[PDB]
Amino acid sequence: IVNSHLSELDEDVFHHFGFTTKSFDFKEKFGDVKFVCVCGSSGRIHNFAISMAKLAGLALPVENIAGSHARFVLYKVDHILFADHGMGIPSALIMLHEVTKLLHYAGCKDVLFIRLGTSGGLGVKPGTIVLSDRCVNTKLEPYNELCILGKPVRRQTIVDLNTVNELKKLSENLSLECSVVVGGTIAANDFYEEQGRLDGSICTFSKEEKLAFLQSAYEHGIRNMEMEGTAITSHCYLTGHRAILVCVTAVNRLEGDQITISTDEFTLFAQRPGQLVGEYLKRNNGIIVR
Amino acid sequence: PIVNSHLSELDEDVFHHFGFTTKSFDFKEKFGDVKFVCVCGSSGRIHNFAISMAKLAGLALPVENIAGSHARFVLYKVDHILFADHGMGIPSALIMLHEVTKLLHYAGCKDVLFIRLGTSGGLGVKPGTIVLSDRCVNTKLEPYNELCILGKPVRRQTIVDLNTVNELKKLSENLSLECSVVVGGTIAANDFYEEQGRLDGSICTFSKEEKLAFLQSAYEHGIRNMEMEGTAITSHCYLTGHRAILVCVTAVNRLEGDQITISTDEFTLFAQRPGQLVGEYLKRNNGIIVR
Lengths: 290, 291
Ligand SMILES: Cc1cn([C@H]2C[C@H](O)[C@@H](CO)O2)c(=O)[nH]c1=O
Ligand SMILES: Cc1cn([C@H]2C[C@H](O)[C@@H](CO)O2)c(=O)[nH]c1=O
Prior knowledge:
The structure is a homodimer.
Chain A: E1 13-14, E2 19-20, H1 26-30, E3 35-39, H2 42-55, E4 74-77, E5 80-84, H3 89-106, E6 112-121, E7 129-136, E8 143-148, E9 151-156, H4 161-173, E10 180-187, H5 207-219, E11 222-226, H6 229-238, E12 242-252, H7 263-270, H8 272-283
Parallel strand pairs in A: 3-5, 3-6, 6-12, 7-10, 10-11
Antiparallel strand pairs in A: 1-2, 4-5, 6-11, 7-12, 8-9
Helix pairs in contact in A: 3-6
């Protein structure tokens, strides 16, 4: 399924990455991509790309392919692209539209998107990696909702469960310093109110109403909460690709709302999804091991 | 009025996305004089605007980031003005709004004006035009921000500070800008492509005829530009006791096309136009002390 309007453009400008289809030979430059790793932080995804380059035995600079005034960054290491997506579904959708167009022009088929994020845990210890087995909205429905030309639309979320299972198996054969849990993930459209936090600038609910909401989620198999999953796992399916979420937790929301861990520990925890996924990528031809 | 009663339960409040806490500073002394908060989606752009304001104010030393080095957002202060970025989209803007309005509360600030200095798609105006929003609406043309809280739909009305908008239009007639300034309505959308009626995304479920009927309808309802944050900014500030305006430049006329074809340099130049107008407004309305 290709957007029939694209070929009618003489040049396609990737506004948020600061380049166009005339900037590179897309087939030659990107044609070998089979994985796209993304997260909300430019610095974090940059450091992950560097880590993958070192695992690949690459001794050459990991250069940002995006323009200097672009909203997003983009790196390539062997068969993996790395991009940030900011925070929230709308921002993620911008990256998704532009990256999936890039893959199309490059002739890349059936690529795996991997979101390496952070999240609020539900009933798990901070620092736990959650492999999402479903991505749902705040009503626990496996759909991303959109309003297109002012009309409501919904798109089903589909996680690549085969890959989730491979990652769980891998974690069982590695010596990790954290637990790896497979469970459901809520995507919310704010950090505070929609996530049931009492510590925002506005709160219209009681602690009892909050607990009921979070306990219900937990009983329905939810183990973490973040802000992008329903976009990533609905969009990729519809453009012919696969997606997974691999997110660490930074707080147990059944215990509190504030992120009280140190900045150093948060950064450490945030690198854990990459620890697991990096080994997976090394074993599954994401990088060439030199 | 109206403060979140739960905040008094905290001995320390951690502003996660700014990388500091209520114990990092004496908030009343540090931020108590703030009367303006200027925001946009780009950290680089808002930093550069803060630098320009510091220069207008006669300040020599560089403008330093107040946010932690590993924070999601940046934060600057020049005299009575705070400057922050907000990323792209309502959810990202709401994170900024919650943390900044909490900051203002702890600092004892009242009736602050938030000014979003953004970029946008124009509807029937030339690229490079500054649009002063006189209302912010969703993609259904309703002046409400929609939320889903504990899984239940909530709607919050949007309110623009029209008196200030009128003051800015009047100011623009007294300045020598490279552009025109238009007052009109602004749609906030939850994506850049499909929700904005663009034909050039990775997915498109509609025709050009359908795109134009949508945008024509919007234009007929007084809409002159389209962006991704306005309904959050203008509903949240009202509820927390503050005021808000949007001052956005256009980078394309969406009635003619979707692609941003102007050069990257010219886009950056256009994006400085809201600050050109707003900076002079701040100079004239005690945002800075002129030394
Ligand atoms: C710790 C945490 C992270 N996140 C994720 C998703 C966002 O992209 C970003 C917001 O802090 O990090 C949450 O949504 N909720 C949380 O409680
Ligand atoms: C030019 C343009 C900018 N924007 C704004 C709002 C977002 O914060 C960011 C997205 O590019 O810039 C639009 O939403 N639509 C547009 O057509």
